[PDB]
Amino acid sequence: ASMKFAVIDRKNFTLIHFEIEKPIKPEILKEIEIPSVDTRKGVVISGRGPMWMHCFLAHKYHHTPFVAVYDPRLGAVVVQSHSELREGDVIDVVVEEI
Amino acid sequence: ASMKFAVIDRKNFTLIHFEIEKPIKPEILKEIEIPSVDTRKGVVISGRGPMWMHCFLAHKYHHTPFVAVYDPRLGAVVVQSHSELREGDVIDVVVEEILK
Ligand SMILES: [Mn+2]
Ligand SMILES: [Mn+2]
Ligand SMILES: [Mn+2]
Ligand SMILES: [Mn+2]
Ligand SMILES: [Mn+2]
């Protein structure tokens, strides 16, 4: 009841947006339940939060063909990948919060 | 000549501070040359940068016993680890950056 995730499926990746409701401590990273996704497809991760929340999640999806992290100015930046894209490639995404 | 790294060794982790000087594009992640460290020891990562820089570096040390990311309010938060600490544990380190 303190952290919501939205998941959106795409031809080429699963998007994960997280929202923080109540303020959080890091212990949360032991409790939190990470959305399960299509492994055959890479992952983009967005949300306003501490870098640690982002990194934690990012590593969590490290088996997928790639992981990218959202930056309002740029899109999703691939930070690691096994199969499809390269570190530093930028997927063209915009995320609107109403 | 756009991104500097400092390394500081400790009994229990290698600290990596990174600094950005020129503004950066994400292409940089293909070039960046990461400080090599004692694998037997975990790693703490401090620096101001985009999430992506943090995550990128963090993942880069993913073999070490753990990786933690510095947060001025809290300390170094373990975000992944193989051997020593737990995700969400907070190493109780203070980092102050002396300006000028
Ligand atoms: Mn794990
Ligand atoms: Mn890997
Ligand atoms: Mn790699
Ligand atoms: Mn691993
Ligand atoms: Mn754990």
Q: How far apart are CA A4 and CA B7, in angstroms?
A: 37
Any B CB within 8 A of A80 CB:
yes
**Residue pair A57/A80 in contact by the 8 Å Cβ criterion:** no
Q: Please give the DSSP secondary-structure letter assigned to residue B32.
A: -
**Residue pair B37/B16 in contact by the 8 Å Cβ criterion:** yes
B51–A69: do the CB atoms touch at under 8 Å? Answer: yes
Strands B75-81 and B13-20: unpaired
Q: How far apart are CA B78 and CA B43, in angstroms?
A: 9
**Tally of CB atoms within 10 A around B84:** 14
Among all bound ligands, the one having the nearest atom to the CA of B29 is 3
Q: Where are the domains of chain B?
A: 1-100
Burial degree of A23 (CB within 10 A; 0-12, 13-18, 19+): exposed
- Indicate which technique resolved this structure: X-ray
Between chain A and chain B, the number of residue pairs with CB atoms below 8 A apart is: 88
Provide, as residue numbers in chain B, all residues whose Cβ is less than 8 Å from the Cβ of A52: 69, 71, 77, 79
